[PDB]
Amino acid sequence: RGSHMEDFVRQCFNPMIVELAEKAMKEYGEDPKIETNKFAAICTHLEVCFMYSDGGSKHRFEIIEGRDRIMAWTVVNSICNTTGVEKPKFLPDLYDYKENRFIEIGVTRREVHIYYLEKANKIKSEKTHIHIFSFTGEEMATKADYTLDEESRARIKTRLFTIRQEMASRSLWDSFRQSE
Numbered sequence: 808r809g810s811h812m813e814d815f816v817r818q819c820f821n822p823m824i825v826e827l828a829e830k831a832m833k834e835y836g837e838d839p840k841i842e843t844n845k846f847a848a849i850c851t852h853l854e855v856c857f858m859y860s861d862g863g864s865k866h867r868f869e870i871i872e873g874r875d876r877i878m879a880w881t882v883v884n885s886i887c888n889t890t891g892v893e894k895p896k897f898l899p900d901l902y903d904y905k906e907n908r909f910i911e912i913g914v915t916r917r918e919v920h921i922y923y924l925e926k927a928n929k930i931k932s933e934k935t936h937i938h939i940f941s942f943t944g945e946e947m948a949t950k951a952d953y954t955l956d957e958e959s960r961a962r963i964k965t966r967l968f969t970i971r972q973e974m975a976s977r978s979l980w981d982s983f984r985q986s987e
């Protein structure tokens with residue numbers, strides 16, 4: 808299939824993230840060799856969720872994204888049946904042991920207002936916290952509770968702009984922006 812996008816994704820992202828994104832797409836019936844704009848997106852979403860869980864305490868967060876569909880649901884079942892939190896209708900990305908809430912992490916190429924609105928409309932009940940990031944450095948969280956301190960969030964924003972820069976340098980940012 809070739810694709811300059813696929814070669815950049817493997818050269819830019821972590822091999823474990825590329826493997827986990829590859830498993831995620833094939834689990835849902837999509838091939839990273841054609842859906843290359845997607846391929847770069849789940850890799851970006853995966854890394855952001857991992858940087859997010861790294862922020863704060865060495866514990867604090869339980870990672871839901873990156874697991875198999877069955878295993879990820881088994882964890883939220885244990886989390887709900889232990890803390891009494893209501894079962895989310897859709898698979899979240901993390902769970903905050905410090906704030907007792909699930910987190911839905913979003914990485915968009917639009918403004919943070921639309922993606923939040925689409926995610927909040929799909930999110931069954933506003934119990935699950937929503938945190939949105941953008942490739943332009945913007946961010947938006949539920950009730951302005953951004954969970955982490957400014958330092959950890961600033962690097963996620965910095966890492967996002969480096970990906971956008973490396974992609975525009977390879978003439979791949981235009982097709983990536985007009986695909987979401």
Ligand SMILES: C[C@H](C[C@@H](C[C@H](C[C@@H](C[C@@H](CCN1CCCC1=O)N1CCCC1=O)N1CCCC1=O)N1CCCC1=O)N1CCCC1=O)N1CCCC1=O
Nearest residue numbers: 821823824827854856857858859860861870871872873874
């Ligand atoms: C070198 C360093 C490595 C990162 C790794 C970490 C991702 C993540 C790893 C796996 C564990 C694998 N499986 C398979 C199933 C059971 C299981 O456990 N998964 C994925 C699902 C949840 C999970 O646990 N882990 C492991 C420890 C905590 C964590 O989040 N992270 C976090 C930053 C980006 C990244 O990749 N580590 C290791 C600890 C410190 C650290 O940063 N890297 C790679 C590039 C950036 C970086 O620092």
Ligand SMILES: COc1cc(CCNC(=O)c2nc(-c3ccccc3C(F)(F)F)[nH]c(=O)c2O)ccc1O
Nearest residue numbers: 831832835837845848849852898899900912913914
């Ligand atoms: C069928 O679709 C996919 C579904 C999954 C499993 C669960 N998915 C998520 O948890 C999730 N996915 C995205 C995302 C990323 C790129 C394109 C589209 C989306 C989505 F908004 F449509 F879903 N962004 C998030 O923030 C997020 O939490 C895995 C891979 C899939 O391609």
Ligand SMILES: [Mn+2]
Nearest residue numbers: 872898899900
């Ligand atoms: Mn997810």
Ligand SMILES: [Mn+2]
Nearest residue numbers: 900911912913
């Ligand atoms: Mn998400």
